[PDB]
């Protein structure tokens, strides 16, 4: 079974985010998405344990 998520962002975001904060705006979204998917999976495993 599959699982997936989208970033959705503008160019202007990335330009300003970099200029103001030193952060990337591609990497943070990438980080959040990859992290959230694995976090949701890890939660699924413990949920099935308590379920079963």
């Amino acid at each position: 079974k599959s699982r997936q998520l989208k970033a959705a962002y503008s160019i202007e975001l990335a330009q300003d985010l970099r200029a103001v904060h030193g952060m990337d705006a591609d990497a943070e979204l990438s980080g959040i998405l990859a992290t959230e998917i694995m976090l949701e999976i890890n939660r699924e495993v413990v949920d099935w344990i308590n379920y079963s």
């Binding site: 959705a8 503008s10 975001l13 103001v20 979204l29």
Partner: protein
């Protein structure tokens, strides 16, 4: 959808500063010469 409506700003860049002042021109207008006494007296 993350855009510039989410990414707030800290401070603006000044870019430039200006100090309007009178162009001070008198050196070329008067016959300036230092005096070394409280009183000056010119010879006609």
């Amino acid at each position: 959808s993350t855009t510039t409506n989410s990414n707030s700003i800290g401070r603006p860049n000044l870019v430039a500063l200006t100090r309007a002042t009178t162009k001070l021109i008198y050196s070329d207008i008067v016959a300036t010469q230092r005096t070394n006494q409280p009183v000056a007296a010119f010879y006609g």
